Design a protein around this ligand. Structure first.
Ligand code: FAD
Ligand code: FAD
Ligand code: 3J8
Lengths: 461, 461
């Protein structure tokens, strides 16, 4: 049995970051990866998604050419052109992350790892065993699909995984789900010319976000040509001559349930959740604790219930973001290999961007969350809504909405929420300020940058 | 003589903001304006500049259409189309600012004000006199042009003022100056198809900015097709058959001076400085103090040397930005009309964006400024340079450069400097953090937003 200081299962965001930082501290480390380095984000996540978003963004701005004094464009978007370049870029990234490991002198173990029943924590890959005083589980998750038993034909639909295998633009797309991935997918497919529907269980998307964002994002989706099918879910999917037929039930409150057949669907995309990647880890061989969804349970230091075994990232089911897996991974490395006992990730005030159109930026508590935590008497929100001067000369419009959530007498900024042009690049700095415990006076004492959208956040009244 | 609590000379950024805030505090206020409300920013500054920048940005991104799988565009940009819409937008803004005053119950006095010799501070407009215990001078400035005596034919050139009167795209443009206005003008004219030169006295533009920015911006200008004429200045301008001939002298260090004639120039644009608007104020009638350039001298509370007379904004020659005039104006209002004796503008850590291509964002001290202030032993800078993943699929490239300047053991962030896509909307939040006295750990403790350019500022090493 080959022994290391650090065995890391999964060469994705969390695994790579943690192994690399451990190695910097002197650890003899190995990374196990059954597929491609970079994991979900690089291969079927953040990176390819962003490239597709950028493409969609081009399509959106192109509508404004004539308004800006430019001749109109020629017609045909070509999905295949961007797909090939996206693929190549992902390949470049894979090669880069492989090299990062090697130059870090981190061993790369190719294959699927599973734990053994061996007393001291030990894994097996392709018949070979490996052990370490410290084993990180960073296996991530994967897209959820409905069982055939619940929804006959569901397997005819694809997921975000399949999305990145698409070779052509689907003529007609139905996206099922109301979370950020669903929204991003629908927004991209629609902007690029797919006749797109987004099917949601209630009245708005992003219901976990601040209500202003939930409302605005749903509206902007509709304004952009995305058909939002409210209080609707899939009952069955059937293969037809032209593509797929989606039978859905719509049950709007105050109305009667009605079943509708959606014909001629080229692409049915399930975006209804992620399942952790733990099924084949043989976690039970060591009594490693999971929840009923298969998420690995950890304390605030990413410890599992078993000594010498840790978990970070999507596999733990909390804040499923690349930078979060990375930060928890690095904090863990510092704790184990720099003996910083207090080293852990603070899961409060993690910023998120949703790449809708326009993009969404959020950090901290929703207004409701603040209300519950501080008391309605101790929360004061400031908000504004405007049309960015970018649109001063266009017939097409998007809105910018901003909300600042303040708590207590000092008006501590405990939440910032926004959607609008530039909001994707706008958030990071404000997240630093919020992390620092900025009050509203801190914002107001900061001189504005004009003319930008961002200045509106430091001149709210 | 009509008496008020507050007489404000100039209905621009600083004047409007100060009068409006005074009025909120109950002041009986009047604003004198000889031309259009909104002053320089609305009429011949920030707003129209930004619209033109947005137009130029379209042109830049259009080069990337085919790379993103879109058909190429048709050819002819039409300046006249955007000019008309820009003009209309400026007209809407004028009407808005007029209305803001009226709804604030601020009297609008149309005409040119000048002080009288009357003992108690009094102004005259169109033969009528007005007085107040508090008179704000907020007259702004105007573009500098060389005297014919120094440069024969200089009056054949225009300034940024003339820029916004242009009805067509000049075929050939020469911009003289190295500051942000020069850079923005050249960048816009060039992006829109003008054969553009930018003539600078030394080797780089923006020499007052951090050296990284000065260097990068000069390079990006060249990469974008702007001819940067280094160590060059105009000796004479002559009207020719086709347009203008610009005779310039170039004196590169280590070389001999050489005179070059630039023929067929349609647009020669002077952007070599701003002169304060004080010449016809009859400041001498009250002994109001100015410098040799005509700037009104003030203390930290915007007091002139004369009791009951104040000045804010470009007329004082310090930090010539709209948000600065606004903030100094409002702080002044609070001091005078809410009796907040400590109310004043902090002129440190004012953020600036330069709308080059890509945009520049800066706040705090350059590296050299930090070095001088803290000692080279007490300054640590972090920097990075990358190509934004937006360009992962394009043949055209721009860079993103970021520098964080840290001082002392705590590594207080005393400067942030950057150029790159999205940097215009990125800066504001970081400016709030820097104002708060953020250290590098504050940045590093902030979870990244991925994939963005902005995340690079919280993961510098
Ligand atoms: C469509 C989509 C878009 C997204 N966009 C963003 C975004 O814009 N910004 C953002 O912050 N996040 C985004 N995410 C989230 C993101 O990608 C994840 O949060 C991230 O990948 C989690 O890191 P991880 O290390 O936990 O898991 P992963 O990055 O998925 O890596 C886990 C790895 O372990 C391997 N593996 C699993 N089991 C084993 C085993 N038994 N043996 C050996 N190897 C194994 C896998 O093959 C894989 O490479 C997106 C996700 C999706 C699906
Ligand atoms: C081309 C250009 C682009 C710019 N872009 C930006 C930018 O993107 N961001 C930014 O923060 N700043 C920008 N600026 C700077 C900006 O516009 C000024 O800093 C701002 O206008 C200053 O405010 P002010 O109140 O001091 O002067 P002004 O806004 O110029 O207002 C002064 C006013 O007083 C009036 N006036 C003058 N004398 C008298 C008198 N004797 N009697 C009656 N009325 C009088 C004038 O007609 C005028 O309306 C730009 C400037 C230029 C020239
Ligand atoms: C931010 N931005 C873009 C981002 C990505 C792709 C574009 O094509 C684009 N075009 C633009 C046009 C005008 C103003 C901004 C713009």
């Amino acid at each position: 049995v080959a022994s290391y200081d650090y065995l890391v299962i999964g060469g994705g965001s969390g695994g790579l970051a943690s192994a690399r930082r451990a190695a910097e501290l002197g650890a003899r480390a190995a990374v196990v990866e059954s597929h491609k380095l970079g994991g979900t984000c690089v291969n079927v996540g953040c990176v390819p998604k962003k490239v597709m978003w950028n493409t969609a963004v081009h399509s959106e701005f192109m509508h404004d050419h004539a308004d800006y004094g430019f001749p109109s464009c020629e017609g045909k978007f070509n999905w295949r052109v961007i797909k090939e370049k996206r693929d190549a870029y992902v390949s470049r990234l894979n090669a880069i992350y492989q090299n990062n490991l090697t130059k870090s002198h981190i061993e790369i173990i190719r294959g699927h790892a599973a734990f053994t029943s061996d007393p001291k924590p030990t894994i097996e890959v392709s018949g070979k065993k490996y052990t370490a005083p410290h084993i990180l589980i960073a296996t991530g998750g994967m897209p959820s699909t409905p069982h055939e038993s619940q929804i006959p034909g569901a397997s005819l639909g694809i997921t975000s995984d399949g999305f990145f295998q698409l070779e052509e633009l689907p003529g007609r797309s139905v996206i099922v789900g109301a979370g950020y991935i669903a929204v991003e997918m629908a927004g991209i497919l629609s902007a690029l010319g797919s006749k797109t529907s987004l099917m949601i269980r209630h009245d708005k998307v992003l219901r976990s976000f601040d209500s202003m964002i939930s409302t605005n994002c749903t509206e902007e989706l509709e304004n952009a040509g995305v058909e939002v099918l409210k209080f609707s879910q899939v009952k069955e999917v059937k293969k037809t001559l032209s593509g797929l037929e989606v039978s859905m039930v719509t049950a709007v409150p105050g109305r009667l349930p009605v079943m509708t057949m959606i014909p001629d669907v080229d692409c049915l995309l399930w975006a209804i959740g992620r399942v952790p990647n733990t099924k084949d880890l043989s976690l039970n061989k060591l009594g490693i604790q999971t929840d009923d969804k298969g998420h690995i349970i950890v304390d605030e230091f990413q410890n599992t219930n078993v000594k010498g075994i840790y978990a970070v990232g999507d596999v733990c089911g909390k804040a499923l973001l690349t930078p979060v897996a990375i930060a928890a991974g690095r904090k863990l490395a510092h704790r184990l290999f720099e003996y910083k006992e207090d080293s852990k990730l603070d899961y409060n005030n993690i910023p998120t961007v949703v790449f809708s159109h326009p993009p969404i930026g959020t950090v901290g508590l929703t207004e409701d969350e603040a209300i519950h935590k501080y008391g309605i008497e101790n929360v004061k929100t400031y908000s504004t809504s405007f049309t960015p001067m970018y649109h001063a000369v266009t017939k097409r419009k998007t809105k910018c909405v901003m909300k600042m959530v303040c708590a207590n007498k000092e008006e501590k900024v405990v939440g910032i929420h926004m959607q609008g042009l530039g909001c994707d690049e706008m958030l990071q700095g404000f997240a630093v300020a919020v992390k620092m415990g900025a009050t509203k006076a801190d914002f107001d004492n900061t001189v504005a940058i004009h003319p930008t959208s961002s200045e509106e956040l430091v001149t709210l009244r």
